Design a protein around this ligand. Structure first.
Ligand SMILES: CCNC(=O)C[C@@H]1N=C(c2ccc(Cl)cc2)c2cc(OC)ccc2-n2c(C)nnc21
Length: 109
C-alpha cells in the first residue's frame, strides 16, 4: 500500500511543468485517428499513456509497484518501436524515462 502511494508521486512529477517540456507528448493516449497514424495499431498492440496509468492507480488496478513500472516502461517501448531512433520524440522519452527510473529506484522500501 505504502509503495503504491509513492507511484502517484513519481507520476505526478512527470506531469509537472518541470518535465512537461519533454513529457507533454506522453500526456494523452496517441490518437491513431486524430494524429493520422494508420500504422500505429499494426505495430503497437498494447498501447499506454500517462493519463491511462493515472486512472488505473485511482481505481486501485495495480497490485504492486512492480506492475506500475511495467506500464510506464511499456509506454516508452511503444515509442521506440513505432518512431525511429533518430526521432525527436525519442530524445524526449529518454529524458522522462531517466526521471522515472531514478525516482522509482530511489523509492523508499
Ligand atoms: C511523426 C510520425 N507520426 C506520428 O504521429 C508519430 C507520433 N508523433 C508525434 C509528434 C511529435 C512531435 C511533433 Cl513536432 C509532431 C508529432 C506525436 C504527437 C502527439 O500529439 C498529439 C502525440 C504523440 C506523438 N507521438 C509519440 C509520443 N510517439 N510517436 C508519436
Amino acid at each position: 500500500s505504502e509503495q503504491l502511494k509513492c507511484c502517484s508521486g513519481i507520476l505526478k512529477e512527470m506531469f509537472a511543468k518541470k518535465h512537461a517540456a519533454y513529457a507533454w507528448p506522453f500526456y494523452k493516449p496517441v490518437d491513431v485517428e486524430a494524429l493520422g497514424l494508420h500504422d500505429y495499431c499494426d505495430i503497437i498492440k498494447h498501447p499506454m499513456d500517462m493519463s491511462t496509468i493515472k486512472s488505473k492507480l485511482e481505481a486501485r488496478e495495480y497490485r504492486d509497484a512492480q506492475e506500475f513500472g511495467a506500464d510506464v516502461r511499456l509506454m516508452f517501448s511503444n515509442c521506440y518501436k513505432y518512431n525511429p531512433p533518430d526521432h525527436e520524440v525519442v530524445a524526449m522519452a529518454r529524458k522522462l524515462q531517466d526521471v522515472f527510473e531514478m525516482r522509482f529506484a530511489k523509492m523508499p522500501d
